[PDB]
Tab-separated table of C-alpha atoms (C1' of nucleotides) in Angstrom:
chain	number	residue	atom	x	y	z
A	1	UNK	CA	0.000	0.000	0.000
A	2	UNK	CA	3.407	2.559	0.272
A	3	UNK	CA	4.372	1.275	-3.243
A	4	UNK	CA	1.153	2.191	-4.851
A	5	UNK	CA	0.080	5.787	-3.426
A	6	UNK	CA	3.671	6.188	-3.482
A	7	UNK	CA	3.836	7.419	-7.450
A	8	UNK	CA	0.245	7.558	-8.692
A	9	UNK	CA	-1.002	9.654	-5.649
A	10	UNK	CA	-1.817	12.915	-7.373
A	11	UNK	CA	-3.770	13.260	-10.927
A	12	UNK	CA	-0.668	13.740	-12.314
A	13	UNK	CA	2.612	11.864	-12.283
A	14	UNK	CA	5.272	13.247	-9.241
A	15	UNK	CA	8.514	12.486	-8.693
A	16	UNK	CA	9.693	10.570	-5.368
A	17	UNK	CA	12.550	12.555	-3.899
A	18	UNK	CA	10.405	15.771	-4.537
A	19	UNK	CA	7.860	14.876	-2.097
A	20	UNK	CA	10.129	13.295	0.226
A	21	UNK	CA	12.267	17.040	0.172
A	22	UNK	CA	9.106	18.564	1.822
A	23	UNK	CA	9.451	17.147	5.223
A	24	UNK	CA	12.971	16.844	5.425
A	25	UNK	CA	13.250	20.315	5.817
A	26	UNK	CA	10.497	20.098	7.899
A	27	UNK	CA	11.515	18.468	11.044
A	28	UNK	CA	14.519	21.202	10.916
A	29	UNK	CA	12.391	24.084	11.004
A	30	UNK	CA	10.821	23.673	14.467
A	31	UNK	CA	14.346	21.814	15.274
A	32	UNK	CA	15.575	25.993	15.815
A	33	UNK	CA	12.664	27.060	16.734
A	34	UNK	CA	11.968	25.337	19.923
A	35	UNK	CA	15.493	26.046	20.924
A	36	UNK	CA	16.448	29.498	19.936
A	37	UNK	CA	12.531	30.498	18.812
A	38	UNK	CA	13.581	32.398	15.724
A	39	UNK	CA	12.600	31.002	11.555
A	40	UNK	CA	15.802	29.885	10.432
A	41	UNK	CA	16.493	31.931	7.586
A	42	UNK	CA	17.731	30.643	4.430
A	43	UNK	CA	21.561	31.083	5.054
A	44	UNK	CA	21.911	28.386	8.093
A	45	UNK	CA	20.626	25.634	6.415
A	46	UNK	CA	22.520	26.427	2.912
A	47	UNK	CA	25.484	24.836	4.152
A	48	UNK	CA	23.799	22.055	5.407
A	49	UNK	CA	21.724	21.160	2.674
A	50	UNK	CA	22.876	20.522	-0.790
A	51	UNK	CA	20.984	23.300	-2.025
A	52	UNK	CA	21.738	27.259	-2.653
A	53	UNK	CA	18.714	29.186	-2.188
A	54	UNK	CA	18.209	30.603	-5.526
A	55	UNK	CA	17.072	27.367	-6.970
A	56	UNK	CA	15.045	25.977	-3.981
A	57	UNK	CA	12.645	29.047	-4.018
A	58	UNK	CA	11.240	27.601	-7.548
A	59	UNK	CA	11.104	23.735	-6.294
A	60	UNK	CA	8.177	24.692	-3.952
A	61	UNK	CA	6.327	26.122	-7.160
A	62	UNK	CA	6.355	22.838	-8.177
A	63	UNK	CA	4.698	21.231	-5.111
A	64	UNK	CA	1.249	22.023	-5.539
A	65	UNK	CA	-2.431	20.293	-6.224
A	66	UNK	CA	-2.522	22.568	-8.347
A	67	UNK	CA	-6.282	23.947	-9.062
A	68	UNK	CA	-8.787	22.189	-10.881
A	69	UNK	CA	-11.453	23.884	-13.413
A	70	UNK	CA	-14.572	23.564	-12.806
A	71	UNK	CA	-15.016	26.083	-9.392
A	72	UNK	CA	-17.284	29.096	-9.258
A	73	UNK	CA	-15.559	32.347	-8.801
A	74	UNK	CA	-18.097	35.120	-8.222
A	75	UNK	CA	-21.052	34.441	-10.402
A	76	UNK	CA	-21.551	31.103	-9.436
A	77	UNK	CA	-24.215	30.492	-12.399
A	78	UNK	CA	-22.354	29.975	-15.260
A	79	UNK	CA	-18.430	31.732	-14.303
A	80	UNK	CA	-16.067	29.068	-14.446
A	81	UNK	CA	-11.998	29.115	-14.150
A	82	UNK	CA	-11.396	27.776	-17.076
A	83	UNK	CA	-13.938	30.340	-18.720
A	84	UNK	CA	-11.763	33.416	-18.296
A	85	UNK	CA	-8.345	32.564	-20.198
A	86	UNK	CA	-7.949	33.729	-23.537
A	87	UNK	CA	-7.108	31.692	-26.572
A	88	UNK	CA	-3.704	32.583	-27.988
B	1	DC	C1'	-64.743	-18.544	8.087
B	2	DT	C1'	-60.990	-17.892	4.664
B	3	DT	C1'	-59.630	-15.978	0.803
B	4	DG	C1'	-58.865	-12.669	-2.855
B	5	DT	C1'	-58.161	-8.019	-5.131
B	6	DT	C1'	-58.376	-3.219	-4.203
B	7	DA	C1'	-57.915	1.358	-1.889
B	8	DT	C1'	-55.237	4.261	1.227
B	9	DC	C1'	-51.327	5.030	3.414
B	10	DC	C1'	-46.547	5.507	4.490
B	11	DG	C1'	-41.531	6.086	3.792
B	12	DC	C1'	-38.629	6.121	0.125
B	13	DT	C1'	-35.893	7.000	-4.114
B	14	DC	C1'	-36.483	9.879	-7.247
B	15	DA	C1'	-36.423	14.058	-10.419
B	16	DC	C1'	-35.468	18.572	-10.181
B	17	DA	C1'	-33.987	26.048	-8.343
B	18	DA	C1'	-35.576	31.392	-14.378
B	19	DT	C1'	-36.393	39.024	-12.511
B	20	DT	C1'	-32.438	41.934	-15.440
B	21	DC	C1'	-26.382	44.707	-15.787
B	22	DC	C1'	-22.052	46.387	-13.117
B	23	DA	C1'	-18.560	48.087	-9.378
B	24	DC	C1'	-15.355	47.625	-4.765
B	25	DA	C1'	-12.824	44.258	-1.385
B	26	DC	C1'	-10.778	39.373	0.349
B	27	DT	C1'	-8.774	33.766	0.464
B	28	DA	C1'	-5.885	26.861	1.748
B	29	DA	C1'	-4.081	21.260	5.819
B	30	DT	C1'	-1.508	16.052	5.327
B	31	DT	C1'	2.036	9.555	4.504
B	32	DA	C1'	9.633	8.360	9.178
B	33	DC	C1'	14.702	8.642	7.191
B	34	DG	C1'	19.034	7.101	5.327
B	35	DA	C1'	22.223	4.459	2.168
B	36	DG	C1'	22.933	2.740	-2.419
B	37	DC	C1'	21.723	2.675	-7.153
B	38	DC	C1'	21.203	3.919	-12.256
B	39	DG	C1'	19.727	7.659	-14.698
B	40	DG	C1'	20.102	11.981	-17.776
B	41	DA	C1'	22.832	15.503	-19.511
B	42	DA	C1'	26.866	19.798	-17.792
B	43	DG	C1'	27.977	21.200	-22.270
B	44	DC	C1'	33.459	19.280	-23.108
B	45	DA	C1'	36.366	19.407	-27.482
B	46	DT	C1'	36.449	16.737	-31.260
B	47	DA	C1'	36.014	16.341	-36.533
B	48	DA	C1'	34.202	15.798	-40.916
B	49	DA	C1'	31.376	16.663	-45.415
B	50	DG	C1'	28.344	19.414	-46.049
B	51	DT	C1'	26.149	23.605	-46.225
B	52	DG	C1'	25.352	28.668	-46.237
B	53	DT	C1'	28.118	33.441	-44.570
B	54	DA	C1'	31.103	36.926	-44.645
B	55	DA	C1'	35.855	39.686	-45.845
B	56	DA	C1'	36.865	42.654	-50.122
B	57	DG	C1'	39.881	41.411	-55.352
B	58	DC	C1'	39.643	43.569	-60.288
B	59	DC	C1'	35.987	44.006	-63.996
B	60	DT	C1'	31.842	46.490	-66.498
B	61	DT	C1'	28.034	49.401	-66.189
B	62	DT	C1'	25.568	53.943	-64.014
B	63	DT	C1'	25.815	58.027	-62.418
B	64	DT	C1'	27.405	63.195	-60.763
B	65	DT	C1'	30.949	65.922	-61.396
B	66	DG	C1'	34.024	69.494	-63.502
B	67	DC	C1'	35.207	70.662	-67.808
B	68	DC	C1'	35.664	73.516	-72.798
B	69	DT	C1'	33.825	76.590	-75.934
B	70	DA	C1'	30.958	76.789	-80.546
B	71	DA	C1'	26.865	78.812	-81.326
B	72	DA	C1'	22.634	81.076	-79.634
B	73	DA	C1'	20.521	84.187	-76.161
B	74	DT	C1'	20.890	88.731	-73.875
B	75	DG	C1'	21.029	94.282	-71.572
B	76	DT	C1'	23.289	99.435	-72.737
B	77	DG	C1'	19.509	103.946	-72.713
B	78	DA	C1'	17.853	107.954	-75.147
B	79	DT	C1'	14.040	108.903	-79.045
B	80	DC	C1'	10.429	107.839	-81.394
B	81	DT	C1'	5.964	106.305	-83.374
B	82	DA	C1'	1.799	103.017	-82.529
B	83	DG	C1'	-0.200	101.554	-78.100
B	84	DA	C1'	-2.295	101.636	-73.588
B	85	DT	C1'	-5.227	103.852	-68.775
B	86	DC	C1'	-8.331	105.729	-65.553
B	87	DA	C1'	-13.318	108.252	-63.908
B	88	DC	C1'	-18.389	108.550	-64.625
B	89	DA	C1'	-20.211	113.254	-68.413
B	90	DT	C1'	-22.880	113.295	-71.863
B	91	DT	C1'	-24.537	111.386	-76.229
B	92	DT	C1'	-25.915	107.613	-78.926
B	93	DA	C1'	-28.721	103.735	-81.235
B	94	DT	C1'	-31.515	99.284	-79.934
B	95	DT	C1'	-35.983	96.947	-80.164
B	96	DG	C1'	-41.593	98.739	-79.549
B	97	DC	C1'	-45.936	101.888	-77.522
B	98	DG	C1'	-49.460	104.483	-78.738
DNA sequence: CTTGTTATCCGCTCACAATTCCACACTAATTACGAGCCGGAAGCATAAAGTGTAAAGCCTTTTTTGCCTAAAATGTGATCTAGATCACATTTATTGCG
């Protein structure tokens, strides 16, 4: 059952590592706070982590549902999401 | 007395919101981690036949330039006849009328 949800979770294929690089810096981020009780700003945990801090700003864009369609938006008769985009 | 179909009743699954534009403002939580593995590509220089670009090297053709000068176009002004100019005063000939 960890093998299945574990790829074909979402509605759309997702990597492993990428959800699995969520918590990690997780159970850091309260790790500082419960000692000194300030956010750990991104300078700290760039030479702990294999990652700038440039480049890790965009990964979260990534990690998202994102939005479906079909959701009312003011009109709630006929206003859709998808019904505002122009066509290009 | 027992049996049937029929009528009335209930709870149930079922089908089913319609006065008409716009403006302002606002908004999201969660699956244990670490070591080892194969994966793509970081974009490296390479090298070749093939291709399409980019210097400017004398030819030929066009086009502006300066040129010469043979032949045609161009002022000199004082005198002199054939031309012109105004305004609005008075005189003239047109078709009819009576």
């Amino acid at each position: 059952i960890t093998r299945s949800i574990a790829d074909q979770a979402r509605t759309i294929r997702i990597p492993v590592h990428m959800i699995e690089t969520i918590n990690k810096l997780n159970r850091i981020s309260r790790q500082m706070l419960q000692e000194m009780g300030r956010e750990p700003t991104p300078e700290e945990l760039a030479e702990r982590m294999l990652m700038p801090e440039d480049k890790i700003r965009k990964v979260l864009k990534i990690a998202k549902e994102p939005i479906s369609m079909e959701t009312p938006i003011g009109d709630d008769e006929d206003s859709h999401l998808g019904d505002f985009i122009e066509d290009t």
